[PDB]
Ligand binder design. Sequence first.
Ligand SMILES: *[C@@H]1O[C@H](CO)[C@@H](O[C@@H]2O[C@H](CO)[C@@H](O)[C@H](O)[C@H]2NC(C)=O)[C@H](O)[C@H]1NC(C)=O
Ligand SMILES: *[C@@H]1O[C@H](CO)[C@@H](O[C@@H]2O[C@H](CO)[C@@H](O)[C@H](O)[C@H]2NC(C)=O)[C@H](O)[C@H]1NC(C)=O
Ligand SMILES: NC1=N[C@H](O)[C@H]2[C@H]3O[C@]4(O)O[C@@H]([C@@H](O)[C@@]2(N1)[C@@H]4O)[C@]3(O)CO
Ligand SMILES: *[C@@H]1O[C@H](CO)[C@@H](O)[C@H](O)[C@H]1NC(C)=O
Ligand SMILES: *[C@@H]1O[C@H](CO)[C@@H](O)[C@H](O)[C@H]1NC(C)=O
Ligand SMILES: *[C@@H]1O[C@H](CO)[C@@H](O)[C@H](O)[C@H]1NC(C)=O
Ligand SMILES: *[C@@H]1O[C@H](CO)[C@@H](O)[C@H](O)[C@H]1NC(C)=O
Ligand SMILES: *[C@@H]1O[C@H](CO)[C@@H](O)[C@H](O)[C@H]1NC(C)=O
Ligand SMILES: *[C@@H]1O[C@H](CO)[C@@H](O)[C@H](O)[C@H]1NC(C)=O
Ligand SMILES: *[C@@H]1O[C@H](CO)[C@@H](O)[C@H](O)[C@H]1NC(C)=O
Lengths: 120, 173, 1140
Amino acid sequence: SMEVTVPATLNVLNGSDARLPCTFNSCYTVNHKQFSLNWTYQECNNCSEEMFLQFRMKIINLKLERFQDRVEFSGNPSKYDVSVMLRNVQPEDEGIYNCYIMNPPDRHRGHGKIHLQVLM
Amino acid sequence: GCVEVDSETEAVYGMTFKILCISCKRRSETNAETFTEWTFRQKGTEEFVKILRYENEVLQLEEDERFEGRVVWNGSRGTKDLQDLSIFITNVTYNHSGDYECHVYRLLFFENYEHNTSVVKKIHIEVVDKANRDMASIVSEIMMYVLIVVLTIWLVAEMIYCYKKIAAATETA
Amino acid sequence: PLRRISIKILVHSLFSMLIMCTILTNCIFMTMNNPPDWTKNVEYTFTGIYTFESLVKILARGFCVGEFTFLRDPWNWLDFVVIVFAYLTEFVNLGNVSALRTFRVLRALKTISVIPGLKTIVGALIQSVKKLSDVMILTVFCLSVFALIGLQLFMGNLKHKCFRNSLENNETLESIMNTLESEEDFRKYFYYLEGSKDALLCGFSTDSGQCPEGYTCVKIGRNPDYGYTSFDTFSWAFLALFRLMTQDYWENLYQQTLRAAGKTYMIFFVVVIFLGSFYLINLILAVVAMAYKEQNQANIEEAKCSPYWIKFKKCIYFIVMDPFVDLAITICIVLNTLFMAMEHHPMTEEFKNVLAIGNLVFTGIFAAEMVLKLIAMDPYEYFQVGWNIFDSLIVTLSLVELFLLSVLRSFRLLRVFKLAKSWPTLNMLIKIIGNSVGALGNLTLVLAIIVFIFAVVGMQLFGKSYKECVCKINDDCTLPRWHMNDFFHSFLIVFRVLCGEWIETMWDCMEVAGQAMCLIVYMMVMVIGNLVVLNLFLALLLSSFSGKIWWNIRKTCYKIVEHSWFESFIVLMILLSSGALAFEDIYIERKKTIKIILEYADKIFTYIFILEMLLKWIAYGYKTYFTNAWCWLDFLIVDVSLVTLVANTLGYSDLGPIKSLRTLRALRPLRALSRFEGMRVVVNALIGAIPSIMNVLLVCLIFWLIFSIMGVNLFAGKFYECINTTDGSRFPASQVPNRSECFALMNVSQNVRWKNLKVNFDNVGLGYLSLLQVATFKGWTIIMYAAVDSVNVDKQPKYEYSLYMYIYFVVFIIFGSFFTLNLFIGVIIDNFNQQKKKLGGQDIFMTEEQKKYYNAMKKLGSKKPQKPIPRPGNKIQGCIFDLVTNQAFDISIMVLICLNMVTMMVEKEGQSQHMTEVLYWINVVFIILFTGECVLKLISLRHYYFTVGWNIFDFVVVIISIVGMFLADLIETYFVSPTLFRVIRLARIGRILRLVKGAKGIRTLLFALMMSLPALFNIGLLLFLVMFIYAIFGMSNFAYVKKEDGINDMFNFETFGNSMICLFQITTSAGWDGLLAPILNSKPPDCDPKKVHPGSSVEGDCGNPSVGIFYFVSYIIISFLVVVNMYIAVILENFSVATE
Ligand SMILES: *[C@@H]1O[C@H](CO)[C@@H](O[C@@H]2O[C@H](CO)[C@@H](O)[C@H](O)[C@H]2NC(C)=O)[C@H](O)[C@H]1NC(C)=O
Ligand SMILES: *[C@@H]1O[C@H](CO)[C@@H](O[C@@H]2O[C@H](CO)[C@@H](O)[C@H](O)[C@H]2NC(C)=O)[C@H](O)[C@H]1NC(C)=O
Ligand SMILES: NC1=N[C@H](O)[C@H]2[C@H]3O[C@]4(O)O[C@@H]([C@@H](O)[C@@]2(N1)[C@@H]4O)[C@]3(O)CO
Ligand SMILES: *[C@@H]1O[C@H](CO)[C@@H](O)[C@H](O)[C@H]1NC(C)=O
Ligand SMILES: *[C@@H]1O[C@H](CO)[C@@H](O)[C@H](O)[C@H]1NC(C)=O
Ligand SMILES: *[C@@H]1O[C@H](CO)[C@@H](O)[C@H](O)[C@H]1NC(C)=O
Ligand SMILES: *[C@@H]1O[C@H](CO)[C@@H](O)[C@H](O)[C@H]1NC(C)=O
Ligand SMILES: *[C@@H]1O[C@H](CO)[C@@H](O)[C@H](O)[C@H]1NC(C)=O
Ligand SMILES: *[C@@H]1O[C@H](CO)[C@@H](O)[C@H](O)[C@H]1NC(C)=O
Ligand SMILES: *[C@@H]1O[C@H](CO)[C@@H](O)[C@H](O)[C@H]1NC(C)=O
């Protein structure tokens, strides 16, 4: 499997900013056309995945209604970094966040999974 | 490979003459397409008139009578990338005297770059009735004999001084 | 009781054998590279045996006393750790699994202890390193100084690339750079030389250059070779220089720097290669060899019906006629071998049949003989003889295929060996080989063990990476030819590094595995691996080794020839005559005036030499004149010149061979050999050794012939392939499998060609050529790719179909190159030893005057104390003086210089302005402190200070440093010369040289080099003349050849400056194959026979295959012979200095 470093559980206070930090590592040098990164959210383990941010040539923020405008990219992918930031976290943000990285020429696709829990 | 050599400046009347214009590409490996123009202004006159154009494989020569019918091409043949452009004249005449300017146009094909360049070579030729040996050639020949005579003279003088001394030694003992 | 049983178990014949057998078996397992799951249990078994062996050793020895007996020995510590990691591996373990396996590799090491005497052998090798320590500091210091000079002179130079002049969209060079990272993208913008990995290197000066029109030169981007080859940083410069010292692919570095820097910098390389590489490597050999002798010799010194059947027997044993029959057989066998030698890629059926018949008669003759010997001596008597045991196998093998594999036949070639008993040298080659597996078998075995550990270690560490990265070292994303994925492949890389080929592979290991790991492993293999190889070579070599008016006129002419002005005058003519030769080149046409004087000038020279020769006849007479070797040389040269002059002068003549005779004019510099005392002396040494050299060449040919014949059978006619002409890429073989298929493609396709290698095994002569390239290691790899790839005679080659053929090349290298070279070196140095003995034990490389000077230098060695000096009367003098003589003062100054040296290292390309200012200021303080120290010594010392030689060097350095400083400053205010500025700053490196005074160990080594300078100079002069004659032959002969590989603008034979640059590269024998490649091709479509060559009369650029081969081969051999001399001169002086 691809070497992707994320916290399995991330506990954040309601109202604070939550950086979702993941590390992707693969040989070679990243290519802009070549490097693609996808982030998805799920309300629960079995719940449908909702893509909320992509990298395809550049960052594409899908502006999902469930996040308002609180999602930001927070990583320099050339550094193997693809972290995201969720500002002013709300209780409904609790759930599973998935990072998928496919990097040419690497055939393999990395996957990081973070369980975000919102304190009180 | 290609070398640039300047053309001869003295031509004997009533005899064939070859004018040399050679232009060499900076890099031999690169491949480009060339064409040439030669323009000549008669001596004692101003401006220039184009006499011939050579593009593709055929040579086009200006219709004027001064150069009409007595010119041949000595340039590279079949290359399509000439490198060497030379003009050969048969039956040289007084009318063929003055300044000759030859311009070269080259299309260089690179990976995604196409380059058009111009280089100009100027040759001035004056006709003469009788060919004359160059100053370096004549002087060198005269200079060579003097050197030979001195060495021969030096050796003989050397032997003469040596011989008298050797002979004298024999007498004493 | 238990202790007795365990102790009983511990010392047993079987137990040592049992521990060892298991260990050997484990090694086979390491080689798996993806062992099946079932093998895991086997892994468990190996672990258990190790623990069991350890327990008995620990249980019995310790006596529950802390294992005092057990851990006291150093070897067991290694043993203790291996069992534990397995327990630990089972126990919670570290994250790196690939890393985890390497630790187990040590189990293989355990083998050193189990085998008898391996423990003794390894300790001896380690003892060797202690001696090597001093040379190591010097190598580091020497490599370091050159690195500093290289960095200051060439930093940022490798960066130059042609950059396009016109850009769309208003883009700037800076704007373009961040935007593009794609390889295709880099290409549109920069020139890129037709399929090469990186952009063409360009140059600012007229000498270097050049970029095609429409492209301009600017420096940006990574250095060539993945950024690995650069002079930007001290660490990078150090790697570049280390590569130059060991001469690995040095030819490429030299070509790259020269192109960017400009040809004038060729001087840097000559000094570095000449002093840094030839000299430093020699020092290592002398120390290792010198060290080996003391230990080898020191250890050695301490020791000291039935009767009727028998009737037939009388006849045969009477018929053997040992005087005629045995002798007759060897002559017969040599004849058979010659029969074998006749083979070609294409042979008519009739010729092939004769081979079948010729072989049978030979098969018949030997067979009749084999039965005959046993009957005469009976089976027990007959079989006992060693040669006979050897022969029967030969007869047996021949009979087996009498009427029945291709591989089986290839062995018939071996028979040729029986010739060894009669020949003295054959005896030497066999004797050397015996030692490798005989007395020195233990030492040779260590080499095998070390190669095995490295191959496996490399495989474990980088095996996974090569497979995943691939794309980081290829386009088809497939594995490269040299890789570390499998054991055989991992083994091949280690083998290649043993030969000096590490850098090409290392760049690649780094792309996939990272810099830190790849560098550490390769550096260790090279240092540790080479030391063992060096020991084996040296160990093997040393062990193996041990009126009458006419009379007055005749008297007078004699007077003229003897006179100094005349001898002096003649020498001037020779130098002048030789010089005129340089001026003729492809550019002679321009500059018509020089051409005319030179043509006339030669005539005066011809007359002078002819005149001089006549004086020689009168003075010496014919008998004295022709009994002299030199005169014959002189007479032949005047004659060739004379014939051309009369033929040119006579007129009419100027057709064919007359023109060919003219090229012999290049031979003129040769007269010069007699005139210089230094040059002549080197020749005396060579003539003395030609007879000795001659016996060896024959042995090598015989040895090589077997390999060449063997090679011909295996690969003859199999190197052909169908290639796409545009990019020279072989077709897949999925389509176009055979030659017949390939032709059909051509009929319907324009650029597909079916073509041979040009250097191959088609015939025995060519095989001889192919083998030479493989032996030298230059151009060899192109051939091997061909050998392994090959399938059949008319079939397209599959990729790595043979695979194991590499074994053929590996065996040849060990026997062909390692052993013969061992023999070649052994005889030549020994012959030199005999020569020295004959001439009253005097060095043979110095002219009499040089000898007087050499003695004076010897005097400098003495340590008799110089006067102390008197503490002045004045207290200031006393106080100032008292501090200087203090021990601390020298150490403080010494430490200060080291501090200064570290400052130079910090400089790097692209350093910010702030860093530059601090470095400038920091240096000024040193400039001030150092100047300060000099003034202080002067105040106290006075006249006494000038007495010491070192003080003067120190004083001079300060003047240069300050002066260099003002000049650099002066240049900035009024001039803007970047190139000039760098050279000026070079003055400081002078202070670093002061470090030498402090280290006594290095000082002795450096001093020794000084002693050999007179001898080295003579050889250098002789070498220069030979290079000069060759350059001239080359200019006329090879200008106009098509430019292919190794021949391009620059590094071509077009002009004298250019020819000299090439010849120098080839002196080391590097890239010799590359130059020869363009010369070999003749006829379409390899080249065009008639070419215009604008600006000149000559037609065609076709190399002469016959003339070209003789020229390159002769040069390689001649240069090698002289270089053997450098190795001999350095060793002699080194022994003397160390000995004192
Ligand atoms: C031999 O190799 C050449 C060089 O790539 C091949 O030429 C390419 O062919 C394709 C399709 O025919 C073109 O689209 C490319 O532009 C060609 N390359 C160039 C730069 O010319 C060629 O196909 C190969 N020969 C054969 C017969 O397959
Ligand atoms: C050489 O290769 C060719 C190509 O396969 C072989 O000839 C035939 O190839 C055609 C395709 O055009 C097939 O239809 C045939 O089956 C092939 N031959 C046979 C008998 O099957 C050829 O046999 C190979 N060997 C030679 C010609 O020596
Ligand atoms: N240290 C080396 N010296 C040789 O001159 C080099 C040439 O020959 C060789 O076989 O391949 C290339 C290079 O790898 C070489 N490496 C190999 O020997 C080469 O440039 C062209 O073949
Ligand atoms: C979105 O994520 C999916 C994973 O299911 C991936 O296959 C796809 O390539 C991603 N989209 C983009 C545009 O990369
Ligand atoms: C020069 O022109 C003549 C025409 O008379 C031609 O025959 C000849 O080939 C030309 N020279 C060269 C070098 O082509
Ligand atoms: C040269 O030109 C003249 C005309 O002025 C002509 O008559 C003559 O035939 C020409 N020379 C030759 C050799 O044909
Ligand atoms: C020669 O030149 C003169 C003047 O330049 C001109 O009048 C004459 O017509 C020319 N000769 C020919 C044959 O045209
Ligand atoms: C460059 O090529 C063009 C073709 O489009 C041509 O018209 C032009 O004359 C060329 N330039 C020169 C200087 O000849
Ligand atoms: C080129 O110049 C135009 C001005 O018309 C400008 O708008 C454009 O940005 C420039 N191109 C680039 C790549 O900056
Ligand atoms: C090419 O095909 C033609 C068929 O028209 C054949 O006659 C010719 O011999 C072929 N060429 C070769 C070189 O075999």
